[PDB]
């Protein structure tokens with residue numbers, strides 16, 4: 258499912274949890290906050 | 305074909321998207337289909 262372009266949610270405001278198009282990773286503000294908070298080790302990339 | 309999981313040899317790479325048939329890794333899956341190579345050749 259995809260949220261509609263117009264965010265007319267009766268005064269409720271979900272900007273900080275919905276995806277942020279600008280970021281290369283389509284993650285919300287809080288998701289980015291969490292990802293930066295956790296200092297992951299041993300990512301397991303191609304290396 | 306080069307993939308985030310490693311080197312994949314012997315599988316043609318398409319740019320469509322289907323359901324994961326045989327999971328490989330890093331979002332890449334493999335499947336057995338006609339997929340051109342034609343319309344019946346598998």
Ligand SMILES: *[C@@H]1O[C@H](CO)[C@@H](O[C@@H]2O[C@H](CO)[C@@H](O[C@@H]3O[C@H](CO)[C@@H](O)[C@H](O[C@H]4O[C@H](CO)[C@@H](O)[C@H](O)[C@@H]4O)[C@@H]3O)[C@H](O)[C@H]2NC(C)=O)[C@H](O)[C@H]1NC(C)=O
Pocket residue numbers: 270271272273
């Ligand atoms: C839903 O809630 C979020 C809460 O973040 C809101 O997004 C932004 O929140 C801030 C703070 O409430 C709004 O005010 C900003 O305040 C900071 C300082 O604290 C200023 O630096 C901002 O100035 C500029 O930057 C903003 C973002 O780039 C611009 O929107 C703003 O016009 C200025 O250019 C700003 O004054 C901020 O206005 C909102 N908006 C944005 C886009 O950040 C969000 O707006 C709420 N949802 C709706 C529909 O309003």
Ligand SMILES: *[C@@H]1O[C@H](CO)[C@@H](O[C@@H]2O[C@H](CO)[C@@H](O)[C@H](O)[C@H]2NC(C)=O)[C@H](O)[C@H]1NC(C)=O
Pocket residue numbers: 303304
């Ligand atoms: C071996 O893996 C490394 C990445 O870990 C790559 O090697 C280089 O890739 C870039 C181009 O993408 C260039 O620097 C060179 O073509 C490659 N060699 C060197 C010394 O940089 C690449 O994925 C693999 N090696 C090759 C030749 O493709």
Ligand SMILES: *[C@@H]1O[C@H](CO)[C@@H](O)[C@H](O)[C@H]1NC(C)=O
Pocket residue numbers: 317318319
């Ligand atoms: C697949 O993606 C686009 C067409 O959808 C094209 O630019 C690209 O070359 C294609 N790659 C292969 C291996 O077919």
